[PDB]
Amino acid sequence: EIDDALYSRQRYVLGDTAMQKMAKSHVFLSGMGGLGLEIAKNLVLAGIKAVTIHDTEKCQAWDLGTNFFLSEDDVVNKRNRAEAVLKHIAELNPYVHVTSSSVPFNETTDLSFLDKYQCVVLTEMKLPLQKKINDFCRSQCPPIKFISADVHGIWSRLFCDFGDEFEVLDTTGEEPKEIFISNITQANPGIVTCLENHPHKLETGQFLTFREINGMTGLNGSIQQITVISPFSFSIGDTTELEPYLHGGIAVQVKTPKTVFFESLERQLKHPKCLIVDFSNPEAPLEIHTAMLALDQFQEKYSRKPNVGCQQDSEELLKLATSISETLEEKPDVNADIVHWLSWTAQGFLSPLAAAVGGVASQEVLKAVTGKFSPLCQWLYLEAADIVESLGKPECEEFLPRGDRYDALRACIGDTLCQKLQNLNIFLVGCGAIGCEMLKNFALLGVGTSKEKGMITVTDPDLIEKSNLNRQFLFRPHHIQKPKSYTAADATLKINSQIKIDAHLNKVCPTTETIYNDEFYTKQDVIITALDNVEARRYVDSRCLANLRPLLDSGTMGTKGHTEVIVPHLTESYNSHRDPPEEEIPFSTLKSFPAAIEHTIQWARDKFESSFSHKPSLFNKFWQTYSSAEEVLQKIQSGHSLEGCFQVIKLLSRRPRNWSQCVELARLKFEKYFNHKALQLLHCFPLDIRLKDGSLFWQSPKRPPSPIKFDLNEPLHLSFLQNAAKLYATVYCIPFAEEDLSADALLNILSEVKIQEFKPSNKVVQTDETARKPDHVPISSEDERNAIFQLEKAILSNEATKSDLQMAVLSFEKDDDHNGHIDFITAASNLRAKMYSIEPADRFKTKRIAGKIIPAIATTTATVSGLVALEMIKVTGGYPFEAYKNCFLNLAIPIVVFTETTEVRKTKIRNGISFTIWDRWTVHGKEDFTLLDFINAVKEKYGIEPTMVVQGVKMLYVPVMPGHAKRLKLTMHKLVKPTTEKKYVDLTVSFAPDIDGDEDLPGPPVRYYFS
């Protein structure tokens, strides 16, 4: 079986069905350039059972700028490129069998040996050989999935060919959407209306199956094609033959395979299916395809690449391209600038672009070997011409090789910019997979190597986990339970010994802001984030905005990913981005009316939290508050309203003392959860109960629950009982052995267990969606008397010692199998599912949902890292606003979207006075500067009067407060008493609305200086 323990996220990303094909899979790859190296890293991280790399060339000092595994001695010994790194390749995954070859490739070379590979990847060989290879593989039975990837300086090319036909099992990879049926009409085609505010996002031609229909019992399980009518209506073919529609009904999306017809490589040369990544230039892919075809023709003609600055070579290439365009089907325009840049950067090689294209190539290889997603069809082109376009006309002397390990980079971008990279200061936040790939990018880029100014700072407080070995490739098995940052720094220094770097074990937060003060940010030049949560991102945004520093953001959600670029005075902010929050599940829905397995999953998560962390913590905190039980009793007798008294007293009263007591407590909890709750619900609302309009109360989406009889013979019952018993024993520190949860031992204790009889009673029920968690209703004195009797019996039994008040609060772990938390949550969720007869779910899905695990894969990480590095270079160049390109992509399609970053805004306030997010106003006064003096200072310095004052969150002035509007006569040093941490104070004030009736209009924050 798959080693899920390491693979983790990938399982959700792809599906174990696909994983069954990563086993038994055999992949060939040749060329072993930098691009080939990145592709190989991605593939080994993916988990291909067998990989055969191949190369014929040996090590050069030039290659040191493109390979991380390479050492100087490898070039010293003139070793073959593939061989010098094959050993390191095996380090990534023992489960992968990787092999190398050096058999020469030529026009007379036999190819039949390649039959043992499902997919073949080609880099760095001449085009005609590629043509022959494509012919052979696509002529094989079955045709062999062919992929050619190439990089030249600041350019790339990606192509795929899976034969004349390819069966894509899943086009999108999304979950099958579920729709609640509101109305059905007997028609041909029958019109079906969903619930209002429930957009269905269908397309005409899709297919769909149904279940639980009132009326058409026959349509349950039937499959129909659909034509969309409205966002909540559509057609499903003839339905007149059947009953009237009664109610209910569920729409389950049905996925179907699709066929993609890849054409031959050579024919695709004259008819390239170029995908578009920039709508503003839907012709650029065609032009670049022509340009590099002309380059290939030049290399064929001269057996060499053009010399940089050799205008003769550029003119020849331009003539060649001019010739080629006419041969094309469309005969598009010719870009002389593109030809010039190709000739200018032919000899170079760009590492980040290589990483990005390699990630995409690995994704296409996975699609080829799985069919899990619609692959590229057929061409793709990526470029970095923006970078060199900003440089105007630099001379070839900037790009001349100088012997160092960055000669190729110098050829790509020029020596001056290379030096700029060498002297940067980067404060990378978080060291997740994205962070690690980033550090690899700088290490290849020589960033910060200059002892003069280069100083790379990264902080991360977490430790290396086994699952993280799937993606954070810089780490090794013997590094688990060790700081991510230290391991990453050591690996980076191994990659490039010249690098200047520092690490930290800190977590970024306002508490640690003392370390990461404003001056530290001033030291920093570019800030990159690799976070996982949103609020931390917003906090970092606020800090960088206060520090006027550029920031880069990225995120990877499975096949999808996004990059955000923010530049001072040019772009908006991540805070300016205001994405809506999640879709709240009503408190009533979660507590009483589940309809989807996710509801029960969250419910079980919350119940676990309350049962094993929250309530135990309340218990422990209470006993810290109060020394002894006698004191508590005397207080309560004297009317002391001690918080949580009832719940805590009930807890200790039901506190077990032995393993059998743990088992019976678990049994009682099971009865309460899955029998008595449903019974009480039914008592409150019988099955026949109906709404005021007369329709059924127990209609969709509400599901009438059905109580469940216990039986240890049911695997679910036994598992739940075991998990609950173990958790409770851990709570009460009850010693135990693994023989205790043997089923026979359990039922032995269970045989004499007296099951309490259910008893309904009147209870307050919230049902409305917006009806939310009610506050504590005051409790009758009768229950206080009950609790008093309980603690009386406890003290009389002397079951009140300090140890009797000691208990170990649990912490929710999700990655370890032996804490049982995942098992318990799975048992509870499945039980609740059957409780309402809702569809069950597997353990792993429950773990993902409850743990809020975001699926991630190596390829998306590498690709976004490449793009982020590119944007970092663009930042370093100080390029104008137009160059930077915010990127969003969904490799599931696959699709790459390039767009200009959102421009900054001049927020006008009054009479044309406009301020951007980058504007922080300031005022200088003295110790006597009162609040009103500050009002006047604002009014004079920016022509606007304040109307309320907040220091951070401190409401310092508002007209609706009578007793504190007098603060106007008070200087801040005595009014707010600013902290000694700052020479200044940072504020935010809104002003009188121009619309009299509206609220105060916010303005830029102000840093006031006391002198």
Ligand SMILES: O=P(O)(O)O[C@H]1[C@H](OP(=O)(O)O)[C@@H](OP(=O)(O)O)[C@H](OP(=O)(O)O)[C@@H](OP(=O)(O)O)[C@H]1OP(=O)(O)O
């Ligand atoms: O406080 P919560 O953990 O959120 O859950 C409570 C709790 O059930 P547990 O005891 O199983 O945790 C209550 O029990 P007590 O804490 O009061 O002993 C129970 O109340 P009853 O004992 O009176 O049944 C109540 O159920 P209800 O609100 O229906 O009375 C139930 O609520 P949830 O489990 O739905 O949160």
Ligand SMILES: Nc1ncnc2c1ncn2[C@@H]1O[C@H](COP(=O)(O)OP(=O)(O)OP(=O)(O)O)[C@@H](O)[C@H]1O
């Ligand atoms: N406030 C913070 N300060 C520092 N590092 C942070 C902060 N918040 C998150 N991080 C880091 O962000 C990184 C995110 O990494 P990544 O997205 O690969 O997954 P993860 O958090 O390690 O866990 P999982 O793989 O289960 O998603 C973590 O290594 C974590 O240490």
